[PDB]
Design a protein around this ligand. Structure first.
Ligand SMILES: CCn1c2ccc(OC3CCC3)cc2c2cc(C(=O)NCc3ccc(S(=O)(=O)CC)cc3)ccc21
Length: 259
């Protein structure tokens, strides 16, 4: 790639992100005074474990749907073979969601936007996975302290998704080329905006992996306890990405083949 080509890549990734960001930043900021009351938090804490799981799994899947669309619109992604598209989304979609989530996290009062209002960690007690929840809140706090712009989130999530180290890729060199061009774009944009200092402050790649592993591990516990709930009331796409041996569905293929 050349230098104008890199800045065109920057513009194209930012555009692809804006079209698929699910919620515009201002819509999340405008709701920050809308906080759950103590009575509403209590109501969430008294919901059954299985109903809170279903609701949370539903919201995760919705967010993952916008990530799939981001990929489909991401320069060079659809030129990868189908196998590698699926590999990359299977391993990276939850990671992208976790990074995007920091937009919905208010570091001032330690709350996250959830079902129309902002609430803290205690909102999720009924899940029985406090360690996973606090890890996500802590990760969202760490990213909020960097004050990502929307352009930086677009470029960083492109790189989270386009990761040539995922096991199972068939055209590893093609993914490497794509990853390298997106890295140049991200680092070029940081340099031009005098934001190279955040590079040392970004989370190690093992953190994002660790959060996704905790998620799958707590899901396995839940699915053992409530197997019919997962079968009857979890989104098919969710089960395909995270469940075992829930990889019996083929939703990703249909989502990618469409359009
Ligand atoms: C850390 C606490 N938390 C969760 C914890 C667990 C969980 O589910 C899995 C555990 C087992 C299933 C699910 C959530 C969960 C979901 C939401 C959510 O969807 N809010 C609505 C919203 C819409 C758009 C945006 S965005 O535009 O920024 C692009 C992402 C962000 C937010 C918020 C907090 C959550």
């Amino acid at each position: 790639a050349s230098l104008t080509e890199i800045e065109h890549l920057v513009q194209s990734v930012c555009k692809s992100y804006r079209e698929t960001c699910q919620l515009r930043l201002e819509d999340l900021l405008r709701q920050r005074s809308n906080i759950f009351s103590r009575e509403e938090v209590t109501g969430y804490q008294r919901k059954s474990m299985w109903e809170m799981w279903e609701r949370c799994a539903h919201h995760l899947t919705e967010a993952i749907q916008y990530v799939v669309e981001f990929a489909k619109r991401l320069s060079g992604f659809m030129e990868l073979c189908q196998n590698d598209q699926i590999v990359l989304l299977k391993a990276g979609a939850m990671e992208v969601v976790l990074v995007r989530m920091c937009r919905a996290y208010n570091a001032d009062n330690r709350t996250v936007f959830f079902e129309g209002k902002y609430g803290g960690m205690e909102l999720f007690r009924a899940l029985g996975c406090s360690e996973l929840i606090s890890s996500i809140f802590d990760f969202s706090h760490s990213l909020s302290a960097l004050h990502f712009s929307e352009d930086e989130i677009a470029l960083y999530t492109a790189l989270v998704l386009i990761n040539a180290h995922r096991p199972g890729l068939q055209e590893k060199r093609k993914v490497e080329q794509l990853q390298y061009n997106l890295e140049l774009a991200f680092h070029h944009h940081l340099c031009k905006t005098h934001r190279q200092s955040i590079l040392a402050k970004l989370p190690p790649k093992g953190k994002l992996r660790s959060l996704c592993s905790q998620h799958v591990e707590r899901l396995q516990i839940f699915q053992h306890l409530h197997p019919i709930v997962v079968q009857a009331a979890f989104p098919p796409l969710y089960k395909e990405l995270f469940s075992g041996g829930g990889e019996k569905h083929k939703i990703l293929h249909r989502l990618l083949q469409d359009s």
